[PDB]
Design a protein around this ligand. Structure first.
Ligand SMILES: [Zn+2]
Lengths: 149, 108, 49
RNA sequence: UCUCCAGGCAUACGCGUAUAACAACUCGGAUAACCAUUGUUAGUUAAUCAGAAUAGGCAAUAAUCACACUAUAAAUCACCUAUAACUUCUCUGUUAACCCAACACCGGAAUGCCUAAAGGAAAGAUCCAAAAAGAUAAAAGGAAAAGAA
RNA sequence: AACUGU
């Protein structure tokens, strides 16, 4: 019975979910790339995107400062969000976080693994999929159709 | 309540050999062009990811030594530089991580 | 005019830095002991090998 | 490093190497990781901590901050007189996450100090079935609060 | 009697 549900049940309670999400968000900000279970990663992706908006809002915002302090346990990160993450994403209007599927852990539980990272980071690029080139026979056939049209 | 009689192997054999209980084959197997190893269509390569993950630890290890303490996350942007690469003017005002290895071909 | 929080370890964490912060809280109480005898009592009320 | 939990440390008793390092990955842990498993090697240091002569003479009056002060359950060798000996530091205990319960049993287990500075982790993954159990919440009403006999 | 999903 999970019809119309918009929230995952994680941790030992709603407070634990926030704390677990809080810990995940703090770790992601520090490292900018974290590997976690797909279900948890999907839940926290929305939170990370909204956090960047709070950084964009401005340092002087009292709500952002309170929000940043609560979500980020490590206080050294608070300057980073306003001075590193927020400046980086000023051009971007969204999609700050990139989440991709990772092979399942071979730890006898076979948990679904995914990696969530902040776009524009200095970390090495992830092995992203590359779409087929237009030089392919099917694409070339479509190219001929395009020229005729 | 206990079984009224022993279950015959023939009856047991049919239950376990029913198609519903048998192991199904998978058709989503794919090849990794980068490493040439197998992968699933919805799953990423692992042989190359092994390089990426280990390289991240090596980069992170260099970062950890440079910081030298907890709660030392910089308030400024960070960049990674490899041997043979020199900082540019745009790199000014950014944390610089120096890697003894040369710039990896995959890393750009 | 941003009220940046202090860059200190969390009090409730299970770590060396967090333990030191908890230690400081007690040490403040010792600094708050007015009488010399109270200082001795606090320092010696626990027996250890 | 972060999140959260709040009986901890010594001795007794019991146990008897379960201690520690290394090497193994078969067995043991009711799964792994890791070892508590397997093999090998090592260990616990005490003049201070703990354990391991004789014959006579003579005794009225508790404690309780012991003073007052009462009470009833009625509550402490010494020192004298003689005899005998005549220059001494070895032995043993010391480890541990440990014991009694057939078990790595949600049980039993004395004393002293202190109450977090000590000591810890409820989450193998996913799903959120029904049914069932526990917990929280109740529009209107109140047996269809803590007041009386 | 009150009290409450009895
Ligand atoms: Zn590859």
């Amino acid at each position: 019975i999970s019809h119309g549900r918009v929230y995952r049940r994680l941790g030992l309670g709603p407070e634990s979910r926030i704390h677990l999400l809080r810990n995940l968000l703090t770790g992601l900000v520090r490292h900018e790339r974290i590997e976690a279970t797909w279900a948890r990663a999907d839940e926290m992706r929305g939170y990370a995107e909204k956090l960047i908006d709070y950084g964009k809002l401005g340092d002087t915002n009292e709500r952002a400062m309170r929000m940043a302090d609560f979500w980020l346990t490590e206080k050294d990160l608070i300057p980073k969000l306003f001075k590193v993450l927020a400046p980086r994403f000023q051009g971007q209007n969204g999609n700050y976080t990139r989440m991709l599927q990772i092979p399942n852990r071979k730890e006898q539980d076979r948990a679904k693994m995914a990696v969530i990272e902040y776009k524009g980071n200095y970390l090495p690029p992830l092995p992203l999929p590359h779409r087929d080139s237009n030089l392919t026979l099917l694409n070339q056939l479509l190219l001929g159709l395009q020229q005729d049209l | 309540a206990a079984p009224k009689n022993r279950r015959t192997i023939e009856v047991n054999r049919c239950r376990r050999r029913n198609p519903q209980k048998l192991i199904k084959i998978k058709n989503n197997i794919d090849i990794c062009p980068e490493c040439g190893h197998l992968k699933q269509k919805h799953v990423l390569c692992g042989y190359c990811y092994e390089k990426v993950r280990q390289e991240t630890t090596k980069i992170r290890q260099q970062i950890g030594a440079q910081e030298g303490g907890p709660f030392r996350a910089p308030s400024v942007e960070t960049m990674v530089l490899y041997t043979g690469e020199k900082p540019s003017e745009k790199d000014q005002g950014k944390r610089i991580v120096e890697r003894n290895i040369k710039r990896p071909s995959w890393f750009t | 005019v941003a009220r940046y929080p202090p860059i200190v370890a969390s009090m409730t964490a299970d770590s060396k830095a967090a333990r030191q912060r908890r230690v400081q809280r007690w040490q403040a109480t010792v600094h708050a002991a007015p009488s010399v005898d109270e200082k001795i009592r606090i320092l010696t009320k626990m027996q250890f090998k």
